[PDB]
Design a protein around this ligand. Structure first.
Ligand SMILES: Nc1ncnc2c1ncn2[C@@H]1O[C@H](CSCC[C@H](N)C(=O)O)[C@@H](O)[C@H]1O
Lengths: 227, 6
């Protein structure tokens, strides 16, 4: 029987979070650090995310705005730099690891002057300002939250969207069930689990897409656009 | 991050 929730795989919630915090504190503040030794796939990733996002930027009644985005689990700002800053007037970043947000100020260069808020906080403790963001981008971090905290964070995110705003999740997906990585202290969830969580947060899918051109050995990665 | 299937 596959596991269907984090409550089947997490022995101790406080340790699940504290171990993850310690893990990221000892990762170098680099693209290869953000990508777990896969820094080389960054351009494939960014190109695909851009195309995915541009779907929602077309003129018409539901056009997503371009005033402000929120990068969640932003790290040093890999995605902020190459995807979001070019498209959004301002960007806010949130991440638990202070050293990454400090590095971001260097990594982002001159364009980084348009990063407004650098929030150093776990997502589980973060309440984005209501009616503030056109796009909330959540990539390679949902496995760090329990199902309850993920559902709650998504509800809070919903409350922070501007009219026509969207949430984008892009992350590793398991073929089946909920799989614990006890080294980085994270989980990988199957598509049915993630969709369940999204539904419980009062959100709906606008689109879902598998990431192409990835190394064969890694978990499949999917993007979901939500409102 | 992206990672090898365990
Ligand atoms: N509970 C939590 N809340 C917020 N950020 C977290 C977190 N647990 C881990 N993180 C952050 O999640 C990031 C994962 S690495 C991925 C960074 C970025 N999303 C990108 O794709 O380039 C790290 O910056 C780490 O500090």
């Amino acid at each position: 029987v596959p596991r269907g929730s984090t409550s089947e795989v997490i022995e101790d919630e406080k340790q699940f979070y504290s171990k993850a915090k310690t893990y990221w504190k000892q990762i170098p503040p680099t693209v290869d650090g953000m990508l777990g030794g896969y820094g080389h796939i960054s351009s494939i990733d960014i190109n695909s995310s851009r195309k995915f996002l541009q779907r929602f930027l077309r003129e018409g009644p539901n056009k997503t705005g371009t005033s402000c985005a929120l990068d969640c689990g932003a790290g040093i700002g890999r995605i902020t730099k190459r995807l979001l800053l070019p498209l959004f007037r301002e960007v806010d970043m949130v991440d638990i690891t202070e050293d990454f947000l400090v590095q971001a100020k260097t990594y982002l260069g001159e364009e980084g002057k348009r990063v407004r808020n650098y929030f150093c906080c776990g997502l589980q403790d973060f309440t984005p300002e209501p009616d503030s963001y056109d796009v909330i981008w959540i990539q390679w971090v949902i496995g760090h939250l329990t199902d309850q905290h993920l559902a709650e964070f998504l509800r809070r995110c919903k409350g922070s969207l501007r009219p026509n705003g969207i949430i984008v999740i892009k992350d590793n997906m398991a073929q089946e069930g909920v799989i614990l990585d006890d080294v980085d202290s994270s989980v990988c969830r199957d598509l049915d689990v993630v969709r369940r969580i999204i539904c419980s947060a009062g959100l709906s899918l606008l689109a879902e897409e598998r990431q192409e051109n990835l190394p064969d050995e890694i978990y499949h990665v999917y993007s979901f656009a939500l409102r | 991050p992206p990672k090898r299937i365990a």
